[PDB]
């Protein structure tokens, strides 16, 4: 669909923060949509990218890829401007075939979304302890 | 024994500090359970590892090993850095014919020695007995 | 400190036993102080040995070590003999710049861990943490 402002609510481990992302246009070379969070100093912004394989008559596999990166700014002595200290990434990839139907893809997506809110993942990501 | 948050109260030299540890799964390679300090960030926090071993063709007796290690953070950049680390480990070694009384006695004896004045003066201050 | 009789109270599983250890001197060849129980036969004693190792060019770390050795005897013959052994070993490592607060924290944390349900189940019942 055509890019639009995306407002996400109830983000955060507390469960109260919100995020508002603005479109940043498509890259013609590889067709990667982009969204960013409003703010000054474009180097300290939260970014989201969405990529989908273009429809073709002879295409075998359809690949959907999503990326997330959140930088943190630390002000240090000897510099007037803040700098990026570390990055927190994410990467979601889906892979279907030409003969798949809509229900399979919707089931996979909803299952992943529900898994990310299960206590197993809430424990394995927030606390970084392996599951055994 | 179920992995669970372990909280230690009234520890430290003064006797007021508390420490709460959170589970971090068990390693499938060597069966070592891990506990990590609640809150904090990785590579800047206290760790505890507990393992229990089975008799095999090399060793004919059980072996329980506990290792605790914790770093000190010093800030000069945005993020802290580790300056030094303090280690400590315990390794009991019982046998297959040992009863529960002996294991409990050894554990309680070790727990009670660390509160004795000898160990207090020989660990806090690094001076031996004379 | 100065070696003297060490008495340990509320020891054992039930928590009503006691134990008194009498000094047995400091070995000059390795600097290991020894505490033993009262008994005529050398092989049936309960021994506690503690040492502190000053840093050298090879190790450049402080190393405090404690050992425990508990034998059990039974008369199968005229006089009892040693059937099995139960061991326990502890060691600490510190750098030259460690403050006494960190060392006390490590000692008290290790003392408090041994009384938690996790260690009680792992050592007494030999149940691995899971």
């Amino acid at each position: 669909a055509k890019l639009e402002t995306v407002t996400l609510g109830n983000i955060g481990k507390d469960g109260k923060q919100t995020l508002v992302l603005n479109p940043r246009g498509v890259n013609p070379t590889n067709g990667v949509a982009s969204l960013s969070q409003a703010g000054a100093v474009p180097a300290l912004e939260k970014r989201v990218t969405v990529s989908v394989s273009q429809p073709s008559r002879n295409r075998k596999n359809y690949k959907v890829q999503v990326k997330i990166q959140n930088p943190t700014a630390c002000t240090a002595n000897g510099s007037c401007d803040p700098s990026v200290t570390r990055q927190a990434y994410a990467d979601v990839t889906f892979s279907f075939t030409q003969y798949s139907t809509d229900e399979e893809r919707a089931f996979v997506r909803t299952e992943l979304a529900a898994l990310l809110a299960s206590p197993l993942l809430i424990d394995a990501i927030d606390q970084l302890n392996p599951a055994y | 024994a179920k992995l669970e948050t372990v909280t230690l109260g009234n520890i430290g030299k003064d006797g007021k500090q508390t420490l709460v540890l959170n589970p971090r799964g068990v390693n499938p390679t060597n069966g070592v359970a891990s506990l990590s300090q609640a809150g904090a960030v990785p590579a800047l926090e206290k760790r505890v590892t507990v393992s229990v071993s089975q008799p095999s063709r090399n060793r004919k007796n059980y072996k329980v090993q506990v290792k605790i290690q914790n770093p000190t953070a010093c800030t000069a950049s945005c993020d802290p850095s580790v300056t030094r680390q303090a280690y400590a480990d315990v390794t009991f070694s019982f046998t297959q014919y040992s009863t529960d009384e002996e294991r409990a006695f050894v554990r309680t004896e070790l727990a009670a020695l660390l509160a004795s004045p000898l160990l207090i003066d020989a660990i806090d201050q690094l001076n031996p007995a004379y | 400190a100065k070696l003297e009789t060490v008495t340990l109270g509320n020891i054992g599983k039930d928590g009503k036993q006691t134990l008194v250890l009498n000094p047995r001197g400091v070995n000059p060849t390795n600097g290991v102080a020894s505490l033993s129980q009262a008994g005529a036969v050398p092989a049936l004693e309960k021994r506690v040995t503690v040492s502190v190792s000053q840093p050298s060019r090879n190790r450049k770390n402080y190393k405090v070590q404690v050992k425990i050795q508990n034998p059990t005897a039974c008369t199968a013959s005229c006089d009892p003999s040693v059937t099995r052994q139960a061991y326990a070993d502890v060691t600490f490592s510190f750098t030259q710049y460690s403050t006494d607060e960190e060392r006390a924290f490590v000692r008290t944390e290790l003392a408090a861990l041994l009384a938690s349900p996790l260690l009680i189940d792992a050592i007494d019942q030999l149940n691995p943490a899971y």
Partner: antibody, heavy 117, light 103 residues
Framework: VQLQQPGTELVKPGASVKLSCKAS????????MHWVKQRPGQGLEWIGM????????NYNEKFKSKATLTVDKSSNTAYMQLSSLTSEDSAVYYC??????????????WGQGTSVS | IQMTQSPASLSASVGETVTITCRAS??????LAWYQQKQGKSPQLLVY???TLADGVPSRFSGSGSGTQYSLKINSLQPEDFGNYYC?????????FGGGTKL
């Protein structure tokens, strides 16, 4: 060392309630906080515990959906949000302060408790 | 681990000693506490290690037992000692309470 509680409150079915709390006389930072429900004539039940340092909750495997626990860092306050109230589970809710010293495991300084219709 | 109290109702009025027993489905290594609730609906703390005692307790209360069987003992019962008694364990996560017993 005492724990203030707002007192009895009345709410219509199918709503959510805050169950506020206040801690005084001690550092709120160090100690756990338990929540206990007592149905009149049915005995005590354990809801869960929370750690003020970082939100580290434990739950009964019951009340998972019904109860959620949060604490604000300053003002020494604890909360207990009940998502759905059919008013069938009308009871008195306490908030004890958990203590976990060596060979000393208990809940002391319980508090007055609040009744919810 | 499930805790249960055997009597669930006791009528001994004054003077005579009383006992309250407890059972656990698993082995808890003395991690047990006893609570007393009067008509004020705010429980107090007792014993807290199945053998020790709290600060305000007049020592007429005493507990014992090991393994999976525990008990509470009262000597020279006095009129103010009337109400409900609950027990719980501290060995695993649920920290389940007991059934309760009324005097």
């Amino acid at each position: 060392v005492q724990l203030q509680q707002p007192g009895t409150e009345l709410v219509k079915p199918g709503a959510s309630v805050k169950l506020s709390c206040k801690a005084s006389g001690y550092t709120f930072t160090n100690y756990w906080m338990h929540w206990v429900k007592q149905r009149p004539g049915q005995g005590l039940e354990w809801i869960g515990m929370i750690h003020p340092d970082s939100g580290t909750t434990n739950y009964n495997e019951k009340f998972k959906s019904k109860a959620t626990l949060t604490v604000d860092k300053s003002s020494n306050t604890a909360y207990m949000q009940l998502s759905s109230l059919t008013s069938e589970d009308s009871a008195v809710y306490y908030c004890a302060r958990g203590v976990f010293y060596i060979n000393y495991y208990a809940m002391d300084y319980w508090g007055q408790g609040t009744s919810v219709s | 681990i499930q805790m249960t109290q055997s009597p669930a109702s006791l009528s001994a009025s004054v003077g005579e000693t009383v006992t309250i027993t407890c059972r656990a489905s698993g082995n808890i290594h003395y991690f047990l506490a006893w609570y007393q609730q009067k008509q004020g609906k705010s429980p107090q703390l007792l014993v807290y290690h199945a053998e020790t005692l709290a600060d305000g307790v007049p020592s007429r209360f005493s507990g014992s037992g090991s393994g999976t069987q525990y008990s509470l003992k009262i000597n020279s019962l006095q009129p103010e000692d009337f109400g409900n008694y609950y027990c719980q364990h501290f060995w695993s996560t649920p920290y389940t309470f007991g059934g309760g017993t009324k005097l």
